[PDB]
């Protein structure tokens, strides 16, 4: 049975990073949902309750696993959680709820600002709604800007991190600024995580066809949108892929913004990947170096 109506939020709060009213997702920061819940008596194994998070956050961030912490009384698992569709979290009770009296439980869940839904700096109201009770927090969200010079800006973001299968994905934006750059070489290197005995990464190259103002400050690239991203991987003799996870790419004319999407493996036993993108450019030479790393959090 849906027993959402049987759950009281005794205490509910959302906090920014380091109990401030701000989150800087490109500095690996997150927000936190804290619940103290009361449950009416008479619940059973398989009964469940839901709450819903605003679409500006999720519970995974760069991770591909969609998990949520168990509700426990001591070491006893009272309910297990799942991430469902549209911001919904559902907790389903175990046999240990049966015949218990005056049950309460504490839940703490890390909330990661979603770069697809929060694409620019701004104030975001984060909400968690359980049984009509809305827990709310206005947070400042601020992103980084990449690294630039007179001729170009280089930026990038880890898109996914898949621990279970030892794979990650990453996107880099290579953007011209003023003057004319030729003979650009762009490289990607695993600074931590390279598997010398592995497979070559899958590297796709895209022309960005939109305006520069509309590039998400969050760093998000919907590369399936062929109106925004024109794949030119095939046009590009100019791409060298290595079994250690590295690539090098030559762009002859940086007359527009290029996007490199990378999908590769990393070495078993590596806690976290560190990925470096470096660009060398020639005005009509300079280097831009951009590092992407990870900050991983437990519930």
């Amino acid at each position: 049975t849906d027993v959402t109506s049987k759950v009281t939020v005794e205490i509910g709060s959302i906090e920014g990073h380091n109990n401030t009213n701000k989150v800087e997702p490109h500095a690996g920061q997150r927000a936190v949902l804290k619940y103290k819940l009361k449950f009416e008596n008479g619940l059973h194994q398989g009964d469940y309750f839901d709450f819903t998070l605003s679409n500006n956050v999720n519970t995974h961030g760069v991770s591909t696993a969609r998990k949520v912490p168990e509700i426990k009384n001591g070491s006893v698992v009272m309910a297990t959680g799942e991430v469902l569709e549209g911001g919904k979290i559902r907790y389903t009770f175990t046999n240990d709820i049966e015949d218990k009296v005056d049950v309460t439980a504490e839940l703490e869940i890390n909330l990661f600002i979603d770069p697809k839904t929060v694409q620019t700096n701004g104030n975001q109201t984060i909400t968690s709604t359980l049984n009509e009770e809305q827990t709310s927090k206005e947070l400042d969200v601020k992103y980084k800007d990449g690294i630039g010079n007179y001729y170009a800006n280089l930026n990038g973001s880890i898109e996914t991190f898949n621990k279970a299968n030892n794979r990650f994905s990453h996107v880099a934006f290579i953007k011209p600024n003023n003057g004319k750059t030729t003979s650009v070489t762009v490289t990607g290197t695993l600074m931590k995580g390279s598997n010398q005995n592995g497979n070559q990464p899958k590297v796709r190259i895209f022309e960005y066809l939109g305006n520069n103002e509309d590039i998400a400050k969050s760093v998000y690239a919907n590369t399936t949108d062929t109106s925004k991203f024109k794949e030119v991987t095939s046009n590009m003799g100019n791409l060298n892929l290595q079994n250690n996870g590295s690539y090098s790419l030559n762009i002859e004319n940086l007359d527009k913004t290029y996007v490199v999407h990378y999908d590769g493996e990393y070495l078993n036993g590596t806690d976290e990947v560190d990925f470096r993108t470096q660009m060398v450019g020639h005005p009509e030479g300079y280097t831009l170096t951009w590092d992407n790393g990870l900050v991983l959090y437990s519930n």
Binding site: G28, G61, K163, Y286, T287, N292, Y297
Partner: peptide, 14 residues
């Protein structure tokens, strides 16, 4: 002047 370096970190669970 000729070489600039920066970086970022993404958050996620685990």
């Amino acid at each position: 002047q000729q070489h600039h370096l920066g970086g970022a970190k993404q958050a996620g669970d685990v």
